[PDB]
Amino acid sequence: MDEFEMIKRNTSEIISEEELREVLKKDEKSAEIGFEPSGKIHLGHYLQIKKMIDLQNAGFDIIISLADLGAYLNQKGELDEIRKIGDYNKKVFEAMGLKAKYVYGSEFGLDKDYTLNVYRLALKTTLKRARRSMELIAREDENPKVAEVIYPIMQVNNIHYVGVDVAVGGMEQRKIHMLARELLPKKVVCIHNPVLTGLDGEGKMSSSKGNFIAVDDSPEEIRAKIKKAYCPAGVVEGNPIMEIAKYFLEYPLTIKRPEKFGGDLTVNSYEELESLFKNKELHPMDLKNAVAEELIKILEPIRKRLAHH
Amino acid sequence: MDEFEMIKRNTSEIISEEELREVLKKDEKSAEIGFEPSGKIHLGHYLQIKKMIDLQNAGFDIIISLADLGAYLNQKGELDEIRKIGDYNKKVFEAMGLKAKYVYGSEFGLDKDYTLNVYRLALKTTLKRARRSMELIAREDENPKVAEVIYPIMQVNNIHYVGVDVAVGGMEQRKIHMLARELLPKKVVCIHNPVLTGLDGEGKMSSSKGNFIAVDDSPEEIRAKIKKAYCPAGVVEGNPIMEIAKYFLEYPLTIKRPEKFGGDLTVNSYEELESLFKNKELHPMDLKNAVAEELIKILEPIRKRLAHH
């Protein structure tokens, strides 16, 4: 497939598709994504970096915005600590084979001209819109603090300074990105990835114990957490194991099953695995064992790349 | 009278009186006030500078914060324009005989460490408190903008950087000043002046046509505006002419009245003028004529000091 279709694969939406086509024609184009520094880099992060890799192969210069300043506003703790996790996250993204520029929010986000642009935008932005765009990003908060309505304007301003033609992120970012398309002279093309269900089956994949697979997890940690994850028989919707199979595994794939009891099923594609699981021919136990093993192989290079340092 | 009593004269409140006494004992102490640049410097401003003069005579080093950055957040227009009016306001305050330091908000209010302190405070400050403290400062606004809740935190942060022991301002500032006493390590002593009724009799003195007396107004402008001002017979409460007599005039004072019709009444103090006016012995027309003339004399040096430049 071409560039457009490769980019579109496994995304929830593109705002907008035509605008992306116009961008693709350009000799030089850029794509950025912002990550608040996270102690654990899990498959949720990986899925987005994989999309940044696709853009990179389509001729896009990639910029990773390490939103330390944004995390600080999102009550992630102190700058110094947050900055340290941002250093760690940078090495993890680098181990993922992605080559890109890494810019800290606090690098330019404390400059006179930047801060001034923040206040200007704050003049244009209503409190209503600001809080609205933070619904899928904040915890609602008993009594919301001023910092919460500053956050979306800081992100929007970051997108402006990075100067990227494309803005990549999760679907929780879509309200801030729509704000960005309204507040900035250059309408940024928005590519949003799907939200990855946590292993618990209760919402998105987060840093809560056993709810995630860290790209640097050890084989035993991967197996254990895959084993005790939400995965009802025949159930595909909300099945974090099926999602992992869909977005991370390579096909054709051979699932190991005890002879006579199965045995050993060769799946040509995710769509085959899907119907096989929905028809209950593939039992959760076998699906888990296969995903655990494939994941170990897939994440191995990343994990060994970090260990070698 | 001593220092404390001179300072207290003609103020609505001091937060708190004891804290002020402790400050007075110090060999070195400072007092600041913030003004959003205004096209017209009227008696409202003058009344506050007069209080800054009292503090100056009590051993206080005075700082005038020209809140250009704050005006910008209060939708007063563009920085460049606002800055120009701030230059004008500085020369007017200087013509008032006040010697002090003049610091623009945008001078330090765009520095890295400053902006960072803004975000920290925004983490501590709830949207509720912020909007609440802006009720007597903003116009409520149909759909409030983010800039409105940033404003009070910028003022509070300005007070912190100026490093003043005392914070002077009008009673509309009291909620922001209470915020300041809560947010900052050093509890600033707050001295609030009364709100001067506009000539219209409808609220505070503002830049609305004929509602103000500019310290640089010409004698004919002063007379005209005093003549057509709200001033019911025998009515002292809400009477802007009586307030002007109370806060700006020197006593004993001799009011010129046509012989036989009056004539010529010598008032020993404001309290005498008060009862005389309330008992209807002093007619509004005569009161106005006297205030107009006294005001012309009082404001003359200021007006001629600006003309000489």
XYZ file of N, CA, C and O in Angstrom, chain A residues 1 3 104 162 167 173 229 232 241 279 286:
44
model
N 0.820 -1.206 0.000
C 0.000 0.000 0.000
C 0.859 1.264 0.000
O 2.043 1.221 0.331
N 1.432 5.555 0.959
C 1.732 6.242 2.206
C 0.467 6.543 3.006
O 0.402 6.266 4.200
N 11.811 19.071 25.111
C 11.117 19.225 26.383
C 10.250 20.474 26.349
O 10.648 21.496 25.794
N 6.225 23.879 17.819
C 6.873 22.752 17.164
C 6.778 22.896 15.648
O 7.671 22.465 14.918
N -0.440 16.476 13.898
C -0.436 16.265 15.339
C -1.020 14.893 15.664
O -2.200 14.638 15.420
N -7.200 13.142 23.345
C -6.590 14.424 23.012
C -7.425 15.222 22.015
O -7.122 16.382 21.735
N -5.369 -11.715 32.856
C -6.049 -10.577 32.244
C -7.486 -10.908 31.855
O -7.849 -12.076 31.700
N -12.785 -13.048 28.328
C -13.886 -14.016 28.306
C -13.922 -14.801 26.999
O -13.558 -14.269 25.949
N -6.757 -8.719 25.147
C -5.895 -9.713 24.527
C -6.098 -9.730 23.014
O -5.145 -9.896 22.254
N -16.104 -17.871 17.480
C -16.784 -19.154 17.325
C -16.394 -20.148 18.416
O -16.829 -21.301 18.407
N -5.350 -20.712 25.297
C -4.435 -20.866 24.172
C -4.094 -19.514 23.558
O -2.949 -19.260 23.185
